[PDB]
Amino acid sequence: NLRELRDRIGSVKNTQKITEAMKLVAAAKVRRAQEAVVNGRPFSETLVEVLYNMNEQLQTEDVDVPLTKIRTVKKVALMVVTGDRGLCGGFNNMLLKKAESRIAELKKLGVDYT
Amino acid sequence: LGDFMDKRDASIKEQLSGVKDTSSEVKQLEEQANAVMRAARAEISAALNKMKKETQ
Amino acid sequence: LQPRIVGEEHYEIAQRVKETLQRYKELQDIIAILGLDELSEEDRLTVARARKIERFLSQPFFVAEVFTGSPGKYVGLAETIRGFQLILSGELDSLPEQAFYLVGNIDEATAKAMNLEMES
Amino acid sequence: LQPRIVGEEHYEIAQRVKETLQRYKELQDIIAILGLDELSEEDRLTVARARKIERFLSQPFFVAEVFTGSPGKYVGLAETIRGFQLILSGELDSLPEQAFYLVGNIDEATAKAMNLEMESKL
Amino acid sequence: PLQTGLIAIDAMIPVGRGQRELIIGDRQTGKTAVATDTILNQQGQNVICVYVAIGQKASSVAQVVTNFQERGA
Amino acid sequence: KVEMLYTKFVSLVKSDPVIHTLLPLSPKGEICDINGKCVDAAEDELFRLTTKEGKLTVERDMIKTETPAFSPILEFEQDPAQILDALLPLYLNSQILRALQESL
Amino acid sequence: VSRVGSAAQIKAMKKVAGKLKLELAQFAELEAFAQFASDLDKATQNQLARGQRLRELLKQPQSAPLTVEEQVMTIYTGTNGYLDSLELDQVRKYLVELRTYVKTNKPEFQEIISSTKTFTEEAEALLKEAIQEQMERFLLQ
Amino acid sequence: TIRNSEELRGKAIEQLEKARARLKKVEMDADQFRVNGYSEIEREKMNLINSTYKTLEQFEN
Ligand SMILES: Nc1ncnc2c1ncn2[C@@H]1O[C@H](COP(=O)(O)OP(=O)(O)OP(=O)(O)O)[C@@H](O)[C@H]1O
Numbered sequence A: 001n002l003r004e005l006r007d008r009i010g011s012v013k014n015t016q017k018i019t020e021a022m023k024l025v026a027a028a029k030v031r032r033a034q035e036a037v038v039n040g041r042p043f044s045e046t047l048v049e050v051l052y053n054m055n056e057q058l059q060t061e062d063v064d065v066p067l068t069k070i071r072t073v074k075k076v077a078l079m080v081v082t083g084d085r086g087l088c089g090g091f092n093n094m095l096l097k098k099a100e101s102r103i104a105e106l107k108k109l110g111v112d113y114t
Numbered sequence B: 001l002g003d004f005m006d007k008r009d010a011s012i013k014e015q016l017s018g019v020k021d022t023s024s025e026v027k028q029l030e031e032q033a034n035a036v037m038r039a040a041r042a043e044i045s046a047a048l049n050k051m052k053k054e055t056q
Numbered sequence C: 001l002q003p004r005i006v007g008e009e010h011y012e013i014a015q016r017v018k019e020t021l022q023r024y025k026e027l028q029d030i031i032a033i034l035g036l037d038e039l040s041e042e043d044r045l046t047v048a049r050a051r052k053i054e055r056f057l058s059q060p061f062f063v064a065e066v067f068t069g070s071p072g073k074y075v076g077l078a079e080t081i082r083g084f085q086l087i088l089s090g091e092l093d094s095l096p097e098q099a100f101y102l103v104g105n106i107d108e109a110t111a112k113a114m115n116l117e118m119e120s
Numbered sequence D: 001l002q003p004r005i006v007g008e009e010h011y012e013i014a015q016r017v018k019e020t021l022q023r024y025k026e027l028q029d030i031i032a033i034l035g036l037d038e039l040s041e042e043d044r045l046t047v048a049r050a051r052k053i054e055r056f057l058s059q060p061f062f063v064a065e066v067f068t069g070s071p072g073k074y075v076g077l078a079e080t081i082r083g084f085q086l087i088l089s090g091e092l093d094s095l096p097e098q099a100f101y102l103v104g105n106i107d108e109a110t111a112k113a114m115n116l117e118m119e120s121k122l
Numbered sequence E: 001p002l003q004t005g006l007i008a009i010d011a012m013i014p015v016g017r018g019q020r021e022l023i024i025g026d027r028q029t030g031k032t033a034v035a036t037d038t039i040l041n042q043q044g045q046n047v048i049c050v051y052v053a054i055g056q057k058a059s060s061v062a063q064v065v066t067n068f069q070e071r072g073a
Numbered sequence F: 001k002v003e004m005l006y007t008k009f010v011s012l013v014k015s016d017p018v019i020h021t022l023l024p025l026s027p028k029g030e031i032c033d034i035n036g037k038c039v040d041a042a043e044d045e046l047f048r049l050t051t052k053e054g055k056l057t058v059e060r061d062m063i064k065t066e067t068p069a070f071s072p073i074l075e076f077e078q079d080p081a082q083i084l085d086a087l088l089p090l091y092l093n094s095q096i097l098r099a100l101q102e103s104l
Numbered sequence G: 001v002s003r004v005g006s007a008a009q010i011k012a013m014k015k016v017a018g019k020l021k022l023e024l025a026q027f028a029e030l031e032a033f034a035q036f037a038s039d040l041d042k043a044t045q046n047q048l049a050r051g052q053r054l055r056e057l058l059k060q061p062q063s064a065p066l067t068v069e070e071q072v073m074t075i076y077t078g079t080n081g082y083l084d085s086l087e088l089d090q091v092r093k094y095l096v097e098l099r100t101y102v103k104t105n106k107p108e109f110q111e112i113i114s115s116t117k118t119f120t121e122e123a124e125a126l127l128k129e130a131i132q133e134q135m136e137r138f139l140l141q
Numbered sequence H: 001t002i003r004n005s006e007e008l009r010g011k012a013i014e015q016l017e018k019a020r021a022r023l024k025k026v027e028m029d030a031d032q033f034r035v036n037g038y039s040e041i042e043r044e045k046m047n048l049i050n051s052t053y054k055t056l057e058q059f060e061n
Helices: A002-039 A041-057 A091-109 B002-055 C008-031 C041-056 C077-089 C106-118 D010-034 D041-056 D077-087 D106-121 E007-011 E031-040 E058-071 F084-103 G011-017 G020-033 G042-057 G068-079 G091-105 G107-116 G121-139 H002-060
Strands: A078-080 F003-006 F018-020 F045-048 F059-062
Touching (some): A002 A041, A002 F045, A091 F003, C041 C077, C077 C106, D010 D041, D010 D077, E007 G068, G011 G068, G020 G068, G042 G068, G042 G091, G068 G091, G068 G107, G107 G121
Antiparallel strands (some): F003 F018, F045 F059
C-alpha cells in the first residue's frame, strides 16, 4: 500500500501548490478590482459633490421625479449580487441565507418581495 | 326599465356570490375527503399496529 | 447491539448515532483539508450534530475527579434514549459544543447550557 | 508503438489520447478537492474529453456478455482511430459521456447517444 | 443458480451452486451474519450447509447454533 | 424600497453583507439602508490591502470630498427640477456598479 | 466482483437487470464525482437520483431473506423507473408495501415465474399492474 | 364572463361531487384496510403463537 499513499502525499503536494496558485491569482484579481474601483472613484466624487450642491440649491420640494419620491410600502425588491465562482466558502452563500431571512422579514409584514 | 336593470344586476351578483360559495363548498368537500381518509388511515393503521404489538 | 436484544428502539438509537458519526468521519478526512464551509447546508448541519453526539458522549468519570477535577456523573437508559433523542430531533440544536461537553446527563447539559449562556 | 510502424497518424491518435488521459489522471485529485466547475476551462474541456475517451475504449466482449448484458463486439482499428479522431479533436463533445459507455463502435455510440437523448425526452 | 437470501449479492454479484464466492472484509461487519443468512435461506432448495466454524468463540458458535435451532436450519 | 444586497468589504475573511436601499433615493447624500446603516454623506470609503504582517488586511478610509456649491453663476439649461430626473439614473448606475465591484 | 456471472443466476433477473451492476458502478463513481455538485447536467441528475434510489433498493432489514421472486420484483421496480418519481427515502416502505401487495393480490406471478425462471410479459404485466395499484396506495398515502 | 363564472361554479360543484365520491370510496378503502389489517393481525398472532409452540415442541423432541 506504500506507493499508493506515497502518491496521495504527492497529490497533496500538488494540492498545496495549486491552492497557492489560486491564492495568488485571486490576489491579482483583488488588486485589479480595487484598481478599477479607485479608477471609477473620481466619477463618484464628482457626481456626489454636484448632487449635494444641486439638492442644496433646489431649496424647496417642487421636485416630482419618480425615482426618489418616497411612496407607499408596496413590493420591496431584492437587488442581490452573489458569488462569482464556487471556491466561495462561507460568506458568499451566507449572504444568500441572510437574504433568506430578509425574505422572511419581508413576509413578516407581508410586503410581496421581488 | 330600472327594475329590469336592477334585476339583472342583482341576479348576476348573487350568481357570483353563489359561485364563490360553491368554490368554498368544493374546498369543504375536499376537507371532508381529506380529514375522513386521513383519520381513517390513521385509525386503521394505528389500531392494527397497536393490536399487533399487544398480541405479539 | 441487536434489535432482538436491546429493543429495536435502542438498536435504531445506536444506528442513528453510528450512521451520522461514520458519515462525519467520511467527511472529516476531506474537511480538514480545505476548510468548513465547502459542504452542503445539510452536511454542515450533520457535522454539527455529529460533533454534538461526540462531545455529548464525554462521560465525566466518578473516579476521575482526583485527576481532572470534575466529580463524575452516572447515567442510564432514560439518558440513553433521551440525549440521543434531543440531539437527533433537534431539540438541543443551538447550544454550543461546550454545552454538552463533559456532562453525562442531557438535562445536565441543558443546565450547563443555561449557565454558560448566563455567563456572557 | 513506434510512429513509423503504426502509421504516423495512428501514432498521433495514440499520443493525443495518452496526453489528455494522463493530464486527467493528474487532475482528478485536484478535482476531488476543488470541483470540476472551478477547475479551469482549458482543462475542464479535456477532463470531460478524456473521461469520455476511457469509457469509449471500454468495449464489450463476446464472452463477457454474461457479465454485461449485451453481446460484445469485434472492433476494427480504423473504426477505433476514427472514433478517437472525433473525440480527441472535440467533434463528439456534444454527446453524453455514458453514450460512450461500453460501446464497440463510434457510430453505435452516436446511435446510443440518440437513444439516450430520446429517453431524455421520454 | 444458487440463492443468497440477501438482495444485493444475487442482484449484482451472483452466487451459483458450485461457484465458490469469497466473502471478505474487516472484523465485526456481519460476515458470519451474512453467512448464516445465506444458510437459512436454504430451506427448500435441497441444499446441505456445512458451517465449518474455525478458531473463534465457542459462545459465538453456540449463538449461531441457537439461531439455527430458532430457524430450524 | 428596493433592498440591494451586495456583500460588504470590511475584513478579508468575514465581510458581512448589508442590505442597501437603492431606489427610491433620498436627500442628496443619503444612501441609507433598511438596517439603519445610513452613511448618509455620499462620500464613501475605498478599500485597500494593508500589509502590516506576513498577511494582508483591508484599508478603507471614509474618503470625503467638498461641497463646492459649484457655481451660483452656472446656468441651468434644463430647469433643475428637470436635470435631476436624469442625474439620478447616473447615481443609480454608480451605486450599482460600486456594489457590483464590492461584491466581486 | 463475482467472476462467473449471470450464468449462475436466474434468467428472470438476468433479462431484467444484467446491466444494473455496471450502472451502479457508474453511479458510485458519479456520486463520488457529484461531490462537485454545483450545476449538474439534467441527464446526470436523472442518473444520480436513479442510482440513488437503486442503492436505496439495495437496503434490506436484518435477516429478512426475500423470496428470489421478490428480488425480481424489486429489481424490476428499480430498473423500470417507477420509483424515480416517487419519494427517495420511502423506497423501503414502497417496497414492503409493494411486496405485500403483490404477495397478496397477484401471487400467481411469483409461482409462474419461479416455474419458468424467465421474465415474460405476464410477469411484466402483473408487475406494472400491482405497481400502479400500490403506487396509488402509497401516494395516498 | 359572468356566464363563465357560473359555469366555473358548476365545475366547482362537479369537483365537489368528485370529492364526496372519492370520500365515500376512501372510506370504503379504509374499511378494506381495516379488514386486511384484522386479517393481518390474525395472521401475525396465529403464526407467531403456533410456530413458537411447534418450535418449543421441537426443542422438546
Ligand atoms: N443486514 C444487516 N442489518 C443489520 N446488521 C447486520 C446485517 N448484517 C450483519 N449485521 C451485523 O453485523 C454484526 C457483526 O456480525 P459478524 O460477527 O458476522 O461480523 P464479523 O465481521 O463476522 O465479526 P467476526 O468476524 O468477529 O465474527 C452483527 O451484530 C450483525 O447484527
